[model samples]
Target: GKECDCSSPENPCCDAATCKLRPGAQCGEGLCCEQCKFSRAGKICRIPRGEMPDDRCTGQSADCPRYH
Candidate 1:
């Protein structure tokens, strides 16, 4: 219910209230979120599909844990 507006269950990059994205707001999920927030710079967010693990964090948090 909380992540209703997120990009997806695996990418909760959206605000719960406004249903959009914001700086430092739980911008990601499952391998893309932490501490209820997105990962910082230098941190690897997760790779998409079969890509490499070089997906460094962007302007938001990262790493959540593969949300089931």
Candidate 2:
């Protein structure tokens, strides 16, 4: 449900949500994101992929896992 470059601090993707990654997201130079959505898992953590894929995190008890 996301498409942004979390690694690029200067790049805000996810055009659906003003094209930006979630807060406290530090896209590694090993960039990886363990999603917070129901049964949703991700890898690599780059643009056109699982960048800002956590709309439910707005109120989820499980905070989205942020990888450095």
Candidate 3:
């Protein structure tokens, strides 16, 4: 089958393999091009330090709580 290999180091699949590789695609250590919420932090998609709000953290500085 000529399947589209959307798997690569730059295209990490977070949890499922349905994700595609693209700019700003959520990537992780094992998966390529994974689907994830922009606001939700994880191995991919890191929130900007300056953009972090108090609500983002429980008892740490707004700059804390960053995705891998």
lDDT of each: 0.51, 0.34, 0.32
Tens-digit lDDT track for model 2 on 1-68? Answer: 24544334544332224334454533312223334122234332333344554332222222344433
Best by lDDT: 1
Give lDDT tens digits, candidate 1, residues 1-68.
54343655344455556555544656444455564465566665555666534566553544433321
Ranking by TM-score: 1, 2, 3
Query: How many residue pairs clash per model?
Result: 15, 2, 9
By lDDT rank, best first, the candidates go 1, 2, 3
Better of 2 and 3 by TM-score: 2
Give candidate 2's whole-model lDDT: 0.34
Using all chains and alpha carbons, the TM-scores for the candidates as numbered come to 0.36, 0.18, 0.16
Residue 47, model 1, lDDT = 54
Residue 51, candidate 3: Cα error in Å is: 2.3
In Å, residue 15's CA in model 2 sits off its true spot by 8.0
lDDT tens readout by residue for model 3, 1-68: 11332444343443234434333433322221224212332333234567553324222121234443
